[PDB]
Amino acid sequence: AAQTNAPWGLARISSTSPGTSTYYYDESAGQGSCVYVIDTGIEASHPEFEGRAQMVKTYYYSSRDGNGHGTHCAGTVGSRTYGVAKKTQLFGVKVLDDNGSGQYSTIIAGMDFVASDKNNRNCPKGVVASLSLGGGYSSSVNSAAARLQSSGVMVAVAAGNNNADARNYSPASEPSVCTVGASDRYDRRSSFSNYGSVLDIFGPGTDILSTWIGGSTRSISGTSMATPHVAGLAAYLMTLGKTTAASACRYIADTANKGDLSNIPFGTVNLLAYNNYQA
Ligand SMILES: [Ca+2]
Numbered sequence: 001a002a003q004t005n006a007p008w009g010l011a012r013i014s015s016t017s018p019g020t021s022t023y024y025y026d027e028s029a030g031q032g033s034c035v036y037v038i039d040t041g042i043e044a045s046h047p048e049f050e051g052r053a054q055m056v057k058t059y060y061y062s063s064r065d066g067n068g069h070g071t072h073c074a075g076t077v078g079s080r081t082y083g084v085a086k087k088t089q090l091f092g093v094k095v096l097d098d099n100g101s102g103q104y105s106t107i108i109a110g111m112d113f114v115a116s117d118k119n120n121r122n123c124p125k126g127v128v129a130s131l132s133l134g135g136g137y138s139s140s141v142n143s144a145a146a147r148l149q150s151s152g153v154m155v156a157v158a159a160g161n162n163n164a165d166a167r168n169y170s171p172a173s174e175p176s177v178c179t180v181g182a183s184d185r186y187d188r189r190s191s192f193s194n195y196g197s198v199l200d201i202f203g204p205g206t207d208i209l210s211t212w213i214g215g216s217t218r219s220i221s222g223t224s225m226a227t228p229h230v231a232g233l234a235a236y237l238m239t240l241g242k243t244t245a246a247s248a249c250r251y252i253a254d255t256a257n258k259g260d261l262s263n264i265p266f267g268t269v270n271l272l273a274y275n276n277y278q279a
Contacts, residue, residue: 030085
């Protein structure tokens with residue numbers, strides 16, 4: 001399948017060179033996989049989700065996304081026009097309030113919730129969790145991410161936006177999950193992206209068009225926007241049978257475009273997520 005005039009980040013993950021505008025992907029498109037988006041919520045009624053999104057848990061007064069961030073990230077995972085895995089099932093867990101903030105105890109509870117809830121859902125091709133959030137180092141937050149991964153869920157987390165070593169941030173610094181940095185459309189490390197030895201992979205993160213609340217769209221930037229490209233890619237590859245939740249981060253790194261990014265400090269991987277699609 002081919003989507004013409006795609007957002008640049010989708011085109012980039014299906015190309016060995018920057019500057020293309022078509023997203024090439026297998027028609028299976030993540031069908032049969034499930035992705036939990038742990039964030040401010042998802043506007044499940046947005047036409048771009050085609051009925052494939054639902055909220056399953058909130059830690060606040062409402063399950064509505066009053067912010068937009070969670071709806072944007074979910075759109076990059078799996079909306080029709082803006083998504084990597086266009087036929088996946090999306091589940092929303094609202095651990096952040098409508099200002100985008102949340103306490104670590106709530107974020108931990110939401111991770112433990114997903115590890116249990118996936119046993120009630122029909123996800124025959126596997127389960128992914130996308131965490132476009134973080135803060136300062138916490139061993140308890142890292143431990144919760146490690147538990148979620150151990151339970152059989154592919155966990156992708158944002159590296160953070162401080163132009164610093166991600167070893168000082170959580171859950172970015174948990175080695176056993178998939179920690180995602182951001183790049184821009186000229187194959188530079190995004191100027192805000194964290195770096196360091198704990199990063200596993202880069203994905204598109206600057207000027208990313210996706211869904212927004214009120215049935216709208218907008219473009220924003222962050223490692224929050226790179227993470228759902230990798231979460232969606234994992235769901236897509238698990239549906240194709242190429243990898244499993246336990247090994248998907250390693251598989252994505254092994255099959256990435258290697259050495260193409262600029263402004264990568266010594267000691268950080270130079271690997272850009274790539275779907276390897278051949279018609
Ligand atoms: Ca890792």
